[model samples]
Target chain A: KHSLPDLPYDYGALEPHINAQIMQLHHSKHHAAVVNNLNVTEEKYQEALAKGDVTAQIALQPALKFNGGGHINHSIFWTNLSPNGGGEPKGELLEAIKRDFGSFDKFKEKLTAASVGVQGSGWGWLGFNKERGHLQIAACPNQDPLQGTTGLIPLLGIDVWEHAYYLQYKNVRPDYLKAIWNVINWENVTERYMACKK
Target chain B: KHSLPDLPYDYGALEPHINAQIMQLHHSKHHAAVVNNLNVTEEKYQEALAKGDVTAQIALQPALKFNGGGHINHSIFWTNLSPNGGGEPKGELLEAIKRDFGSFDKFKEKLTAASVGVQGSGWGWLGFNKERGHLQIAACPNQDPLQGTTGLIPLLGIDVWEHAYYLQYKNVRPDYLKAIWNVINWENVTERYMACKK
Candidate 1:
């Protein structure tokens, strides 16, 4: 069964950029619920699989995708932020961002636009295109995982879901997006990018 | 060009249940954006159609569906509530509710479950199935219109998007759902149901 992972830092660590109440609720309440639902969905899916109930299995696909992706996405998300994060990356990741997106600022612009362009609940991602061997940007609706839905290796993700910023930023999503840049764990993103190369 | 519709009553009209703040932003901001975007999307779609650009048309499908459905959904949603609303629907509408969903309370339970069950952004609807000739409950992800997506005539819709309740209800969607029943415009819903039968 999948379990909720502990956050890398205290709930209030990403203060100013992300407030304490939002983090506490996001991690303890939202992410925890996703983990619990994912486990339940998987158990039900297992039962359907064992019973050879194709109809039931088909019915469970949405739950599995939503909950499972919620679990996968949130687990990665916790590691993707830090109190001492922000600023640009160094070495290969930086080089790749420059090579693929022209410049780091341009990459940021693209990602921010994608995040803001999301009409409703979704995520904007900087993902690694394994086949092309380049960095790419993409958006996924609802809780669809980057790898599962689009075959892209997620390096960094910006959750555009209202719950992510509604309490703190209200309807001004771009402000939340701008603030999130200050907390982005570039080192963690770089590590994910490097892992894709290997 | 599609335009944002004004709310039938004052933003504060549905106070205590929905609150003025949520209603103001939901109408003046969220729904307005959808209207403007829908017009832009349709203009782009028209250009693509004229140019025989199938790729552009296909690419525009998501935007068109999202913005178009947003427009349709919100237009109906405004009329679906009033300060002097709620309680059980009357006449054939009430009979239809009882006939289709066992009883009014059961119908409420089902609709509430559907709304609360939406993992991300979406809406819950009490719709009329023209083919089935009965009331049906459905949940739609993002801004998917009930009629366009499912061939069901939307009688009454519940906007379960976080923006619909986040300001007031926070993460407790069940509380929002419970409170919404107090402001349901049964008269308007009855009209929609009657129109569908005609």
Candidate 2:
């Protein structure tokens, strides 16, 4: 029954940084397909889970990961940006970023490198490691949800899927990564970090 | 320095069943990429293994599996199809198919269904369960090698990756599956089965 949520702002809100066409297609077509697929997969997985059908579940792992992660990643991706976004974090979020990665600049460098180095469709994440009580950066491939696949609570994610940037940045993913910071909603990222710290 | 092997026949050899364009791209581009990536990954893994860098090894797993499986699957796939193929398996392979699946028709039906049912990029395989001394069927996501990922020795693999048929069959995968049978090299499949059964 889960449906694609409405984008928090107009499709053109992140213009210049993300472009209206990319936002509209990414949200409406790409994100919507994932949400719809995830629902179908969850319904099937629920039955398999109830029946203790290990084989069926194993066979369904790719769909579960691909569709489920697609749904999970995009949901967070929406709020992680804003028209009135960017600049820098404040309070505990800033402190933690400094402590973990040396400085905000270094953190950005590491995250950007991770995101750019992703060889295929994937995301670069700033995730909270509850066990280590620290922040970690990771790259996950092909719609792999950060929390479910890596057990790192996703605080911020930069999608590196070509669909996310090809229309705007083409094959130069680093360009997209560089521009994405302009729309990053620090407030939303801070909120996720705060919830995880608790 | 693992490199791509030459195809047993011309790219257009399996024509009417699988087109030359698909064969050329699948072999020259897709399979070549896997071979190239596998060599790079194995080099990194060698260093990780030698240094006992468990984290690095864990991180390298997806690349290893994806590229490794891509190499393994396509190598077998090329041999599994032939210009002079089809009719049906003979001798021991036929008997084994009957014993395991009731009849060749039923076996074909099950494998066709399995191949058709793959939700995304994957392979449907008729593998041998050496421990059980029986035939088994499995579907693997992305490039997971049949034996390495599932403990089943791959005898015949039907690649369902979009690139495998998209050029010729487009979105109608079942039609591709149906046409592929005209080129199924049961002689090669039988040889593979016998080697594993030994």
Candidate 3:
């Protein structure tokens, strides 16, 4: 299995949005721990499934999904950001976001609002559905991924985990969020956007 | 009546984590609107209180309290973070967090997990109950604050608001949470902690 991914930039590179201490602990300590736990949980889940231990399987489902999804989500998250990130979209993707949502900035506005507005521990995502032929934005709780559960291709993601900015932005998550755009990897976003097209 | 408090930092200070476009909208546009609406709601309730309009008061109570409480919570939330944020706690607060929740790291784990585990639009809070003299971590929906409702003082808050990070982080909210601690005002937290002693 692939190990947890490394961050594209230094932990403090995103400061004052994200501090090196927070990033280091969050990535190396928190997320890495999640990855480790998920690996172990998945093994147990596989064993339970093989044994047809329905009770165990059912009881283990939430932990398996939550921790497994945590690892999966963070693995993607590390790649989603770059110190040199953000700018207007181009080509087909820009046209699609506009066609679907009216305009790029407007969609960005709405999407940004929605992501930061998640009620608690959750995530906001820009998603695509080739079947529906539209771009959509949604928020999900915990570590749940968009595509796997909702049949939508993830285009972009924002982590609302307190650790995401607790060390840098503290209780002022908005400030941290306000600063994260500097490190977004729009290159990855464009690729995902392209893949969503039929 | 007081107006919405100005943000401590300029819209652009958060820079990369969020963005000026989103920050202006979130603080000036969205949160300001919430404050304005809350004031209006409270005015109506105060009128009901004066007129002895029990039904009106009852109907308005939910709205006024929710909005009013929301305004109060959000108002306090602004002071909880700063550019100079994050670090291990000191004195009684650290000891209490450790005593009640095993260790600071464990408390962090539980609180983070609880906040992330919130089902929908809600808040995960670490609260200090002066009456009972216990430190409790709790969750609430929408804008409900601890203390007035739960008999606890709000220590830290994560907005879970989508605007907090959608522009920057998209669906990876955990990243937002992890990054925000860089701006955490542990002094504010210590003050709150000390206040509980009174």
Candidate 4:
């Protein structure tokens, strides 16, 4: 029973930055479709796994990754942004950022570059590596979930999918990446960082 | 320089099963873009390799697999079809299919199901497992070349990419799979199967 959760704020809350149209379509249309498709794919996968259908399961990987990751990535993505959010994190989260990435500004520069560097539809993440007890930057192609594919716990995710910013940004992806920082919910990221430590 | 090879016959040769529009767009636009992108990626990879840039090389993998696989898969795919083709194969190829899959009809059923079962952009292949000395059926996500990803030498491939059939078959992929059998070039497949034995 996978479902699209309600966004914490109104669609227009992040306006002038993310815009109401992108948020509305992104959540209601795009994210909603992936949630429906993921449930359908998972149901089929359950039967295939039960039947030990190796080829069937193998064939389902893309769907599982695409729609499943879409659901997973976007779920966290909504919580990772806030209209009132911006600026640097505090406490141990800030310390870890300095230790791993050298400084808050450097971390911002690296993550922005990674987001801009995505060749196609993808996400750039600042994830926590529990094993190493550090912060890391990574990018995933399409809807590939960071945690599922990489063993990192996602703290912050920047969606670079065309639909995320194409309407407002046109072909200028770097501009979108630049503007996204102003709306980042550092409080949410710090909370994820603290959870990863435990 | 990487290039788009001439199709063995006129684009319209496959008739109503695959219209000339699909072939022309598939070969000229889709396949050509892959070749161009592969060349670009390879050029970057060469520089990365020479400089011992492990991170750069690692980041380049998706592009390498995607565009490179697109180039490799399409190179084999075009020759795997012919207007004068279709009907059952002969000699060792037919014998191997019957032996591996229990029968030719069974093999067709499995491959057709795999092709239609692909949830998104992908390929279904009847490939030679060189190490095992047998035939195998596989489905690869996106443009992943059979050999590059799985070590299976492709004998025949069914392109399930939307552009491959959407122009003619629309959403009815099963119909396209059924239609493609009419143009399967068994002669080329036999040549590949024989080569794998060597």
**Which structure among the candidates has the greatest DockQ?**
1
Compared with the true structure, what per-residue lDDT tens digits does model 1 show for residues A1-198?
788899999999999999988898889988898899999988998999999999999999999999899888999988889999899999999999999999999999999999999888999999999999899999998899999999999999998899899988988999999999999999999999999987
Candidate 3 on B1-198: residue-level lDDT in tens? 747888877777665555677667667765786678788887887888899999997877666655666677667666776666677688899999899999988887777776666543566788887777878888776667777788788887766555566546644667766766666677888888888787
Candidates 1 and 3, the one with greater lDDT: 1
TM-score of each: 0.95, 0.65, 0.56, 0.60
Task: Give all candidates' CA lDDT scores.
Answer: 0.93, 0.88, 0.74, 0.88
DockQ-better candidate, 2 vs 3: 3
Rank ordering of all candidates by DockQ, starting from the highest:
1, 3, 2, 4
Cα shift from native, residue A179, model 4 (Å): 19
Of the candidates shown, which would achieve the greatest lDDT relative to the real structure?
1
Order the candidates by TM-score, highest first. Answer: 1, 2, 4, 3
Q: Which run of 10 residues does model 4 chain B get worst, by summed lDDT?
A: B163-172
Report the C-alpha lDDT of model 4 over A38-128, residue by residue, as the tens digit. Answer: 9999999999999999999999998999999999999999999999878889899999999989999999999998997775458999998
Across B1-198, the per-residue lDDT of candidate 1 in tens digits comes to 688888999999999999999999989988998899999999999999999999999999999999999999999999999999989988899999999999999999999999998878999999998888888999998999999999999988999999999878888899999999999999999999999887
- How many pairs collide in each candidate, listed in order? 0, 0, 74, 0
Candidate 2 docking band: incorrect
**Superposed model 2: Cα runs more than 4 Å off:** A6-68, A78-123, A129-134, A140-144, A148-152, A158-198, B9-25, B40-68, B83-92, B112-121, B149-151, B161-183, B194-198
1 or 3: which has the higher DockQ? 1
